[PDB]
Amino acid sequence: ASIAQARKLVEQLKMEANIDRIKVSKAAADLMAYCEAHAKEDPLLTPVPASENPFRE
Amino acid sequence: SELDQLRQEAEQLKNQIRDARKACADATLSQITNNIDPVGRIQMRTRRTLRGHLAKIYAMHWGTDSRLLVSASQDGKLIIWDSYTTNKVHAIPLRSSWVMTCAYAPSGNYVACGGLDNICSIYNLKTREGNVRVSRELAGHTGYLSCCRFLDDNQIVTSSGDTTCALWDIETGQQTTTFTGHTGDVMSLSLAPDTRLFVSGACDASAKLWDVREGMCRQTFTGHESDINAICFFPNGNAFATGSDDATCRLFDLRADQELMTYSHDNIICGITSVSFSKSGRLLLAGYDDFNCNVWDALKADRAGVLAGHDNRVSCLGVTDDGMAVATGSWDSFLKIWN
Amino acid sequence: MVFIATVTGSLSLVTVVGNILVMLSIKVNRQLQTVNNYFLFSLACADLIIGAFSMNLYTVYIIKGYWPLGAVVCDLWLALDYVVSNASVMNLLIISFDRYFCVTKPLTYPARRTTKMAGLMIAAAWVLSFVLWAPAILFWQFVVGKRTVPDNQCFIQFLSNPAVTFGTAIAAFYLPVVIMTVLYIHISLASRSRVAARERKVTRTIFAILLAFILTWTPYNVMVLVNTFCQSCIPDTVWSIGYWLCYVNSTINPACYALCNATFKKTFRHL
Amino acid sequence: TLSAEDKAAVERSKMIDRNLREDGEKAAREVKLLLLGAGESGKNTIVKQMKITGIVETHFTFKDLHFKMFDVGAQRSERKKWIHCFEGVTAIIFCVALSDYDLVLAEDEEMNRMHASMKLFDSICNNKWFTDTSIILFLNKKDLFEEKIKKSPLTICYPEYAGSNTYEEAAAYIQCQFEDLNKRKDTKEIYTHFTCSTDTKNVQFVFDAVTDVIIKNNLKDCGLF
Amino acid sequence: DVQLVESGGGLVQPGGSRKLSCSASGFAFSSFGMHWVRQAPEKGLEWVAYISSGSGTIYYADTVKGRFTISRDDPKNTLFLQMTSLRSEDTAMYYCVRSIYYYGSSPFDFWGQGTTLTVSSGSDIVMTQATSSVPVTPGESVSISCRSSKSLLHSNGNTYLYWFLQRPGQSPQLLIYRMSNLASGVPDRFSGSGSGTAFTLTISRLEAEDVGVYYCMQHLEYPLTFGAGTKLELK
Ligand SMILES: CCCCCCOc1nsnc1C1=CCCN(C)C1
Ligand SMILES: CCCCCCOc1nsnc1C1=CCCN(C)C1
Predict the structure, then answer these.
(1) In chain B, how many domains are there?
(2) Domain D30-217's class?
(3) Which residue of A has its CA nearest to B296?
(4) Are residues B187 and B176 in contact, defined by beta-carbon separation less than 8 angstroms?
(5) Count of CB atoms within 10 A of residue B45's CB?
(6) Ligand 2 in reach of C155 Cβ (< 6 A)
(7) What are the structural domain ranges in chain A?
(8) Hey, how many other C-beta atoms are within 10 angstroms of the C-beta on C236?
């Protein structure tokens, strides 16, 4: 019946529970470091000169 | 009495997951990026307008060259555009006009479209005959196709309203992997850069991280209050963002297994149809039902800009692989390139 | 002095603001960019010309008591005014024909009538008004061989001659009004459900626009016939009332044609 | 200016534009009908009469008018995620089986199939995407209903029913109970027909109702309505 | 299978008229622009005429202008060349060539077998292939060079020069399109480079199936002009 569906859900929850997690601070610092490392390569964040813009020029 | 014991062990496992998430939540993203400088005001203009579609545009996907793009509209046409010159490179008539999703292969040799027909049509763009013809019709799903992304020329992952996702081999035409677990209609998916993992957002207000090779659900992410319509990875593949009908966007971290940020405003009550990140991931662009597109600060949860060039709902949205431009497709039958 | 110039400037400012709000509602909103609205754009253009140019020269004619500006401008103003008013009335006629063919042939005619045929009908209406009125006004003096019109007064030279009078009155007002009446009668007949509120609403709109056109353009066109039957019957204040009534139709045309559509009504409030 | 290959690419784009315009005109000259109605309501019989997984499209031509009918009954997914695809259909045909007045839902115990049909009709009629879309209502199985009504009363379905227990009064009461569910009475009309099963009466009704819808839409376009 | 078959050749007298035909099969003919190219019996290739897809654009070479008329029948998949007032200089083998034009396309990619016509008895870009014969030995790497009187680099970034190989007894085959792109079905040993005015095709590890005449062609502006051709022979 539904007992196998419930067993599957329990097994999935166990697999999701038995993972290792880093601190939110560390992941936020990694995201911030990625954003500041590629900030000069983002044309949207920093407008490129009109000579180098394919759509504008 | 087995059922009650299974469901109590399930609620204990959910409490354990919630307590582990609370344990690793030592700080917030707003407390750490509180001292960085703000982006400023992002003013983007409409560089190009792509006219030709005569019905609502439901999906657009950029090509890896960052010049060619495919669009899908419900009149019954897929159009490959050259976005630099606004030239129509190809017009492909569809056998079923109820298309909801389109994809561009990374190589550039194929395109795919899925819809209410429950079939994924793979079209070959580089034929000796000079026309585009159907190369494959992937059948097997029992619900409409919502999103399809190519991993390579021979493998494609699709999401459906049958509550399941699938990995297909285009050569044999047979599902290679089936991803099950979602209890709601899967509305979107997004491949990781490396293409080893994909996230899927569904109508059960949850997102799931899937392993392509193993076929298993690694992590489940909750926090939304309604149907998750859109999902997209952060450029380094360690985070993703979801957009939903609750008028909020959320940023989730895979390694921390939690929600990091919520992008919302009291003056927004409409749902999010599409989400994408910029090249560095600093800007998060979300399409809404208010006929506008909002540009948010992905580290500070501030609204940095508005792309207001459409007369109807912004159904779809994509950022190029070099990050030079943003294309928005809408229900008013027009595609716009912004910069 | 100030009262008359104030009320005529107010009337011309309404005639200009309404028609430009109509044209801006057509250009801004894309739901109003249809084939049926190009005729409304042409009507709005003609009414803009009438309100901005003809009303001010008429109110300075009637506030001076005579025509100060001179003969050459008098011929130009008469020519332009008559051409752009007959173009407004041919625009009403082709609107009536387009509505008749959209209602009585609903499955075929909106496919056959493209943008090309709409532009052809608008251009045909404009050149028919031009060909009818401009050479008969500018070049009448060369025909007769001497201007009979006294200086300091501006009016039509050929009013005396009954043949051109009757032919122009027929071809400008009396023939389009019976065609418009017959076509709108058959529109209100063919608007009934054949499978109510719909027939009543469209017959109220039809009665409103027909009453507006008839009440605006019937005084002048019976004064013309009374003048050509009795040369010395009509006072000039009556002539003035007749001209002004012919002018107010341009003012009321946005409310009678554009503002019947609710999309125009919500685009007007958004300015 | 452009090179020679750029000029030829622009010419190819112009030809693509021309073919898109021609296909758009040919698609605009067609009538789109969305066929809804709960399961076992007679929809299949309707499709069979008109014609002589996923979404099924039936193409027919009656009196030089081309009709595309889209059946979405196989879509078992959430309806509110794809119903906005059908926002600009010409009309909706909803099929109701009269014989189901005293029957009950197999899936849900003690749930009258007529109440489920009324709930679905109220859901799509007052839907936010179908505000101006007219609805053609087909009340199927009049003969079966007529035979059943003599034995079984209408008061099983509607306890507030007070009229006669005959065919005409019960049929008019059922038609009234579907047509009063329309909240936006001004914007949309409901064309009700009792399917006759004879030769071309159903398609003729569809033709007449679609002609009335095309008239009302031309009136709205011409500003008269 | 893509096939272009030319008929209508033969001996003609001066001042006469003939109609050449090209039957197309195995591809969507109406979406391709078509060209007529001639080859004099001992000389190089010369471009004659061009009709676009949809017949909207038609170009002719100066030598044949006013005498030749190019046309196409798209329901019958046929290309026609009506030649009137023939001259002795028009004796040549005529080839119909398919070219499709869109971003990333490879024009001039299929050449028909050609039909033989025998007639009894200033600002054009000049492409120069200085050497006319290079003796080669299998296995080695060889460079063929072409130069242009005008810079073929356009402002859009494209350099419109095409490399073709004609084997002995066959029709020419497209090797390189737009200076560096390698054509479909061509082995990876062929490579094209250059800088605006001077260009080089490098064949690494030469095989016996690479002998024949190599032609450079510009596609920057009409009329299209070919090089004189560099011949590769063994020993
Ligand atoms: C010989 C006189 C015939 C009269 C025919 C109708 O009059 C017009 N046809 S075209 N424009 C007019 C106008 C006349 C005066 C006022 N103006 C604004 C309109
Ligand atoms: C308060 C109203 C005062 C009107 C005075 C001017 O009368 C006119 N309006 S239009 N044409 C005339 C004429 C004037 C002189 C004679 N001419 C033949 C007619």
Answers:
(1) 1
(2) alpha beta
(3) A45
(4) no
(5) 12
(6) yes
(7) 1-56
(8) 10
